[PDB]
Subunit: 280 residues, 3 copies
């Protein structure tokens, strides 16, 4: 795989996300994630999956801002998406319905679709000092269209969901945990051993226990919410701002490490600059 | 000009400053003015965000005016024009809950009863850690919250904590309210103004249609059955002898004065004991 | 004072106190389940009682977990089962009785509660715990099963599915601060203040005027958990039926479960049984 690596042993698969320079989620990663998770879902030797990043600053930056430039790659993904779920929601929805226990180890920054990925897993543990979660979408003239509005509604409640989405700020681990967006914030220097212990302890459970727990606690019914989000999100592309802001962002350094570090700041200054065409 | 509110706007943010001396009770006048101002603002394309704050240095909104039943005609007109299946008190929070703009409460001081209902109804509430307080005083006046509070709490904090807030009737500090999810965040008192201004400006700066899209994706909670159940529970308690005795006794012992409102919980417990 | 084997009940001024006392570690056995039903059914009909406070006589354990030998005397368990509510299993019947009680129910948690003990704590209207000393865990996964007394659904409602899965599958003992942050209990308080705190809340609620408690509960009715509880029963029943579960439980008893020394670190004890 070109955007990730997988290894498994002792009932735990580790999926390490590695797509330089900032771990954007592009069409290739979306396809490779589907392949790896679909294959694992049929592997009776694997009981737990742990997602981590190889990038020292970013878990998953956000969805590739150039993803709409090659609609054919996107059209192929959209054709394999489940009923009533859009091509972006299909990533989080695959994670949410995975048979294995899914665990995210979050050390760095995850925004937009990356933050959706984090919230979709069964459990997420984040480094107190270094981790960050933000829904950057509003600053690109859109809203989350990959399940984020609904994952937030369910985990943090509507009031805090609207705050996360509309302030579009980068939330630190301690705030994200107190909101319930992730399970726990832990010291950065303890996080790796903590997640390894949780994963191995869950994988050591007797046969059938994980299955029973997931049957007793089935995935939330989000069908109507995901449809509503899709409709609202689709409508934001019928307005000119989204493409102006996405183009302006790329011009000003989005999807480079310096540009992504304070993406919120970068996108607000792009909006303040307000460049656009003049066809007089 | 309004007699209980000051309204202004700039850079896409309307400020509504609550100003009804001596302790910022929600009376019939304020209820009428709020309907007018929020309905006017709902169709104002220049306004994206509404921030509520208080001109009183101790109280955000004390609670509903305990003398509001002395002038039944103004209250009855408001009741006659309330939305279907929403009582006249619930109509305050319900108007806030369905406002098109992002609604933000900046809570520096104490809010009880209907005041606490108002805080919980806004899209977001940020409170001063050292100075803010939230409580449902209703149980101490022999009733339960009848303006949406039971259902706002159920949604925000869960039934277990909602029963605790309602039946203990204690004044919660900002830190505990935020932990519970009753408000969004507790911030230092000397940072709250800047924090709220930054959030308000950032949301007002979002491009056309984003706020609308977010609210479409995150529609207001369906509370119809819960509000009707609260209404019937409230009417039943209000009809029993203790309610009017406690309300009259509280007024005689200094409720709705700043000295009485400071520790309203202790005052109302003492009224019941005496 | 000697009305019951596993409980002491007293009441005055509108507050009933139920002290849980079944040495050596406050296991929930068939006798406690029967006595709890008697006491709570009686109080439900007592207009003079407005608040029920549950606490423990055991300095280390609130309620350890359900008696690991409860299946050895099927007749006692059969009578309890035969008379459980429709769509509610015999273990769920304990939490469900507490959930539908007319009085305000309050748990004062100073020590450790696991399994059905944690389910009990979560079922009350409100639970206050000592920050320094209290602990809550769902041990069931380490015995080859899942919670079968409502705990999956009480966790789902109070902490959300994500944290419910974490609690159930890690099977660790959660401290009071973490449990409160998650919403599993109402609040963590200093150990030396907890008793006065709870007494104050109970007294204050009992002093409320006629009809207020009743109105509050009418406005905030118990969650509908019918389908969740049915699902939990089938998941629990299927795992419990397997030899692996039966050997883990047998080994736990062999290695000192249900003794104070074995119960202090039950998680470690049960992980050692499985490794052996």
């Amino acid at each position: 795989y070109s955007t990730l690596r997988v290894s498994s042993e002792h009932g735990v698969a580790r999926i390490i996300l590695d797509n330089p320079p900032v771990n954007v989620i592009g069409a290739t990663m979306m396809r490779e994630l589907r392949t790896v998770l679909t294959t694992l879902a049929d592997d009776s030797s694997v009981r737990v999956i742990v997602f981590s990043s190889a990038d020292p600053e970013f878990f998953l930056a956000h969805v590739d801002m150039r993803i709409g430039e090659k609609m054919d790659a996107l059209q192929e993904l959209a054709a394999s998406a489940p009923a009533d779920v859009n091509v972006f929601q299909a990533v989080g929805e695959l994670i949410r319905h995975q048979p294995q226990v899914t665990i995210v180890k979050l050390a760095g920054k995850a925004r937009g679709g990356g933050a959706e990925f984090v919230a979709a897993a069964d459990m997420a543990f984040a480094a107190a000092e270094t981790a960050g979660l933000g829904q950057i979408e509003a600053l690109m003239g859109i809203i989350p269209g990959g399940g984020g509005t609904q994952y937030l509604r369910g985990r943090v409640g509507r009031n805090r969901a609207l705050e996360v989405v509309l302030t579009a700020d980068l939330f630190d681990a301690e705030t994200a945990a107190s909101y319930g967006w992730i399970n726990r914030a832990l010291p950065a220097d303890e996080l790796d051993e903590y997640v390894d212990r949780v994963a191995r302890n869950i994988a050591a459970l007797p046969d059938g226990v994980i299955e029973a727990a997931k049957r007793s606690l089935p995935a939330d019914d989000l069908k109507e919410g995901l449809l509503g989000e899709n409709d609202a999100w689709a409508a934001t592309f019928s307005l000119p701002a989204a493409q102006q802001l996405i183009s302006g962002g790329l011009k000003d350094g989005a999807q480079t490490p310096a540009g992504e570090r304070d993406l919120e700041g970068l996108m607000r200054s792009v909006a303040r600059e307000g460049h656009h065409h003049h066809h007089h």
